[PDB]
Amino acid sequence: LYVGSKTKEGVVHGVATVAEKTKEQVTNVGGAVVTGVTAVAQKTVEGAGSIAAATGFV
Amino acid sequence: LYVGSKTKEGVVHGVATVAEKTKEQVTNVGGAVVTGVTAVAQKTVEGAGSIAAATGFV
Amino acid sequence: LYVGSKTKEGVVHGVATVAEKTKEQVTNVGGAVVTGVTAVAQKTVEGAGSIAAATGFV
Amino acid sequence: LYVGSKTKEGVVHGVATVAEKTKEQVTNVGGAVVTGVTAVAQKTVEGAGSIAAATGFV
Amino acid sequence: LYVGSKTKEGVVHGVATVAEKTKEQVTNVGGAVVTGVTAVAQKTVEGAGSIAAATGFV
Amino acid sequence: LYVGSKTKEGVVHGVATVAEKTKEQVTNVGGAVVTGVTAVAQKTVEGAGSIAAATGFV
Amino acid sequence: LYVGSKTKEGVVHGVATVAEKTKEQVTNVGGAVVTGVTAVAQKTVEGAGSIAAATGFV
Amino acid sequence: LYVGSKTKEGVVHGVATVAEKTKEQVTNVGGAVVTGVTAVAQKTVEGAGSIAAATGFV
Amino acid sequence: LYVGSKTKEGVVHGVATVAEKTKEQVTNVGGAVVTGVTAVAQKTVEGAGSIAAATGFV
Amino acid sequence: LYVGSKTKEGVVHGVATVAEKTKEQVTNVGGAVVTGVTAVAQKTVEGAGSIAAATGFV
């Protein structure tokens, strides 16, 4: 006898991550760089939910 | 006897990630670079839910 | 005796990812580059849900 | 005795990905480049759900 | 006899992370660099919930 | 200027495995049952290297 | 200028494993049952290197 | 200028394991049952290196 | 200028393990049951290196 | 200028373990049960190095 049961909104589970010998050089001038986005949820009832964004200027 | 049961909105599960010897050089001037987006959900009731976006200018 | 049961909206599950020795050089000037988009869901009730987008200018 | 049961809207499952020794050089000036789009679903009740888009200008 | 039960809004669980010998040089002048985003949720009832964002200027 | 270089003897690499909802009942009396053999190498300089073997009697 | 370089004897690497909702009943009387063999190497200079073996009797 | 370099004998690396809701009943009388063998190497210079073995009797 | 360098004998590294809601009933009478073998190496210069073995009798 | 350098014999490193809500009932009469073997190495210069073994009788 349920009403609104076992709900799941914006969920992540069961994540396993391994990284041995990654080399990662980066060089930038006046930009916007993004790496390394792992295992992120969110909720946004009124708004823009952005992840991994980059605008060199406005 | 359910009402709105076992719902799943915006979900990820059962993720396994391995990365041994990736080399990744990057060079940029006035741009917008994005890598490494792994295992991300979200919800957005009113708005633009963007992931991995890049605008050099506006 | 169900009402709206076992629903699944915007779902990903059962993902396995391996990457041994990928070399990836990138060079950019005033652009918008995107790689590495893995295992992402979302929901968007009112809005533009964009993934892996790139506009050099506006 | 079901009403709206075992529904699946915008789903992906059972994905396996391997990548050994891919070399990938990229060079760009004032463009919009996209690679690496893997295993992404979404829902969009009112809006344009775009994936892997690129507009050099507007 | 439930009313609004077992709800989960903006959740992450079951995360395991390993990193052996990653070298990561970074060089920047007047930009905005982001790496190392792991295992973060949030909720946002009225506002823009952004993660891993970078704007060289405004 | 190599002598015996980049050798690989008895190797496996780049394996990805997914298994969603497999049911597997087994019943046995005085036998020898084997399932679930995944991603195994070995070397054997002097001997019988057997994998997934079953002898009800001797 | 190498002598016996980059050798690899009995190796496994780059393994990713997912298992969601496997049911597995087993029943046995006087047998020998084996499941769940994942990601195992070995070396054996003098002997029988066996994996996943089952002999009801001898 | 190497002599016996970068050797690897009996190795495993880069393993990621996920298991959500596996049910596993087992029943046995006078047998030998084995499950759950994950990520094991070994070396054996003089002897029988066995893994996941089961002999109801001898 | 090496002599016997960077050797690795019987090694495991880069292991990540997740287990959410596994139910596991077991029942036995006069047997030998084994589960849960994770991330174990060994060396054995003179002898039988066995892992996950079960003999109901001898 | 090395002699027997960077050696590694019987090693484990980089282990991460999570376990949320595992139920595990066990019942036994005159047997030998083993679970929960995680992250164990050893060396054995003269002898049998056994892990996770079970003999109901001898």
Author numbering:
A (entry chain B), B (entry chain A), C (entry chain H), D (entry chain G), E (entry chain C), F (entry chain I), ...: 38 to 95
What did the article's authors report about this structure?
Parkinson’s disease (PD) is a neurodegenerative disorder characterized by the presence of Lewy bodies (LB) and Lewy neurites (LN). Spillantini et al. (1997) identified fibrils formed by the presynaptic protein alpha-synuclein (α-Syn, 140 residues, ~14 kD) as the main component of these human brain inclusions. In vivo studies investigating α-Syn aggregation demonstrated that activation of the inflammasome and more specifically caspase-1, the enzymatic component of the inflammasome, leads to the production of an α-Syn fragment truncated at aspartic acid 121 (D121). This C-terminally-truncated α-Syn form (α-Syn(1-121)) aggregates more rapidly than full-length α-Syn (including disease-associated mutants), and its production is associated with cell toxicity.
Here, we report the atomic structure of α-Syn(1-121) fibrils determined by cryo-electron microscopy (cryo-EM). Helical image processing of recorded cryo-EM movies produced a 3D reconstruction of the α-Syn(1-121) fibril at an overall resolution of 3.4 Å. The quality of the EM map allowed an atomic model of the region between residues L38 and V95 to be built. The β-strands β2-β7 wind around a hydrophobic intra-molecular core composed of only alanine and valine residues and one isoleucine (i.e. V48, V49, V52, A53, V55, V63, A69, V70, V71, V74, A76, V77, A78, I88, A89, A90, A91). The less well defined β1 and β8 strands are attached to the core, while the first 37 N-terminal residues and the last ~20 C-terminal residues of α-Syn(1-121) are not visible in the 3D reconstruction, indicating a disordered structure in line with quenched hydrogen/deuterium exchange – solution-state NMR (H/D exchange NMR) and limited proteolysis, which showed these terminal segments to be unprotected in nature. Two β-sheets (one from each protofilament) interact at the fibril core via a hydrophobic steric zipper-geometry comprised of β-strand β3 (i.e. residues G51-A56). The side chains of residues A53 and V55 form the inter-molecular surface contributing to the interface between the two protofilaments, which is further stabilized by a surface-exposed salt bridge between E57 and H50 that might be sensitive to pH, as an unprotected histidine has a pK of ~6.2. Our 3D map suggests structural contributions of some familial mutations to fibril stability, since H50, G51 and A53 are all involved in the inter-molecular contact between the two β-sheets from adjacent protofilaments at the core of the here studied α-Syn(1-121) fibrils. However, in our cryo-EM structure, S87 faces the outside of the fibril and hence remains accessible for disease-associated modification in α-Syn fibrils. Instead, our cryo-EM structure reveals that the PreNAC is responsible for the interaction between protofilaments, and places the NACore at the very center (i.e.the core) of a single protofilament.
